[PDB]
Curated annotation (Swiss-Prot), chain A:
Protein name: Cytoplasmic dynein 1 heavy chain 1
Domain of life according to the entry: Eukaryota
The record's note on its domains: Dynein heavy chains probably consist of an N-terminal stem (which binds cargo and interacts with other dynein components), and the head or motor domain. The motor contains six tandemly-linked AAA domains in the head, which form a ring. A stalk-like structure (formed by two of the coiled coil domains) protrudes between AAA 4 and AAA 5 and terminates in a microtubule-binding site. A seventh domain may also contribute to this ring; it is not clear whether the N-terminus or the C-terminus forms this extra domain.
Residues of the full protein shown: 803 to 1120 of 4646
Assembly and interaction partners: Homodimer. The cytoplasmic dynein 1 complex consists of two catalytic heavy chains (HCs) and a number of non-catalytic subunits presented by intermediate chains (ICs), light intermediate chains (LICs) and light chains (LCs); the composition seems to vary in respect to the IC, LIC and LC composition. The heavy chain homodimer serves as a scaffold for the probable homodimeric assembly of the respective non-catalytic subunits. The ICs and LICs bind directly to the HC dimer and dynein LCs assemble on the IC dimer. Interacts with DYNC1LI1; DYNC1LI1 and DYNC1LI2 bind mutually exclusive to DYNC1H1.
Family statement: Belongs to the dynein heavy chain family.
Role: Cytoplasmic dynein 1 acts as a motor for the intracellular retrograde motility of vesicles and organelles along microtubules. Dynein has ATPase activity; the force-producing power stroke is thought to occur on release of ADP. Plays a role in mitotic spindle assembly and metaphase plate congression.
Disease per UniProt entry: Charcot-Marie-Tooth disease, axonal, type 2O: An axonal form of Charcot-Marie-Tooth disease, a disorder of the peripheral nervous system, characterized by progressive weakness and atrophy, initially of the peroneal muscles and later of the distal muscles of the arms. Charcot-Marie-Tooth disease is classified in two main groups on the basis of electrophysiologic properties and histopathology: primary peripheral demyelinating neuropathies (designated CMT1 when they are dominantly inherited) and primary peripheral axonal neuropathies (CMT2).
Record localization: Cytoplasm, Cytoskeleton
From Swiss-Prot, chain B:
Disulfide bond entries: none
Residue ranges of the TM segments: none
Keyword Transport annotated: yes
Lineage, highest ranks first: Eukaryota, Metazoa, Chordata, Craniata, Vertebrata
Covered range of the whole protein: 103 to 373 of 492
Protein name: Cytoplasmic dynein 1 light intermediate chain 2
Gene Ontology terms: biological process: cellular response to nerve growth factor stimulus; centrosome localization; microtubule cytoskeleton organization; microtubule-based movement
Gene: DYNC1LI2
Amino acid sequence: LLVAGLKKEVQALIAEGIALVWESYKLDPYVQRLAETVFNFQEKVDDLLIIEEKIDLEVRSLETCMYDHKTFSEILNRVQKAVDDLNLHSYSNLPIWVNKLDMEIERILGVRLQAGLRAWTQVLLGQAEDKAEVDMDTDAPQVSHKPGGEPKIKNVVHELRITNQVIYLNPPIEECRYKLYQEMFAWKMVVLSLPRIQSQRYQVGVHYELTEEEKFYRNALTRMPDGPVALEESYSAVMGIVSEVEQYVKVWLQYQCLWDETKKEFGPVVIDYGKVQSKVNLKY
Amino acid sequence: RCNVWILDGDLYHKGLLKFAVSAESLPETLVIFVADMSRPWTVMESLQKWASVLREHIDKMKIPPEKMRELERKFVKDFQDYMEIPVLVVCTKCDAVSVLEKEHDYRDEHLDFIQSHLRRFCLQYGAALIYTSVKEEKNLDLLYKYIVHKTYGFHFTTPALVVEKDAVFIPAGWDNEKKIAILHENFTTVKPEDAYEDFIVKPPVRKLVHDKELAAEDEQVFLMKQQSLLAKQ
């Protein structure tokens, strides 16, 4: 597509020569004309092959690169510059090829985003495998980082305290619900907040409408190969750990009727009750 | 502290609704539906989309019919017992009406058309209508009071306003077809039975209409063309 405009020009001059004859002296200007056009067609084709392989390598890197925004965003910076060079030399059909490449990039951001959720879900549930369990018999160096990365959900702590014979949770299971989803929302922004490639970025002040889905890959969560199952898995983990903490907090709230191990962990969620444990012992 | 759940607009995420509402939590759930007044032409259609999606969700939930009849009895009891599950329609970015007066040459008739349609829809589903503008901070406290009233059973005293074009507030049970008939008087070119799509048109936004994919003719096809040209000569 990119060489479509240049190739037709040669066909036009070829079409012109198909009418010419040796008896005309128009052959000799034509010989000069065809050589220049064919010479340009060879050069620009050679330029694209160099650039296109770089873009092919760069997009391939997205599959195997580390799962962090900077690592992704750096890669998406390289590909944008190459496309800007394509826009800079005035190649044909660039939005189509860019639109195809843009679709391909989102697809790769789909699988990495799918891996990121599942790695995050494993970390949330405690099913994330520490690197101690990575088998040492596999002599192949595992330099290829995990496709889902190594999500680190900061340990969540809530407060179970009693104030004047009233037991309450300082961090509510609703704020725990808020916190746990907020940590998740950070992880999806590893991918969904990446810059979207624009064919006409190099045009500044171009009068084209740009929304967030145009600006970023906000639609990669719809490009998951496994569908929304990974996302459904991700939230399903949150409810259960929330649900057990809802259950675990309930049995302590039952002891309020007394008036009317010091901590427990649910994956990243931590509940601290050593303070209330003391007064429960005294009241009992 | 009331649990809040806002679903992604895409139906690709509709399956998340099971994590938002359950059998035990359904009576405790208050449903809020957003109506976009910056894009009024998709208001009714998107509203039926979301209401339908809620209908299939409650269909999947598999509640006993006795419990379903009990919930409907409670809801209708709340309905007729109104004097001066639940569903609450909130209109957002109503100040865009001021743009509609300029950009699309709207008048009070179009506003009567859309709000009469919305009130009739609310009657169809027995919902409460309110008009809001965060940009202008309109009816935010009224909204908050009404939510607290309907969820926690708190008191509520504000009366129903249906006169102001972009601040209409109709609590549950106030609306009726006879009460809706006041707007039909103000019509002078449209009729209450006239279609929504015909009177209010979806503008054809001037997106960058992409050009045809121009592709270089293959060597074989171009040379068959040249064969055709040479042969006739």
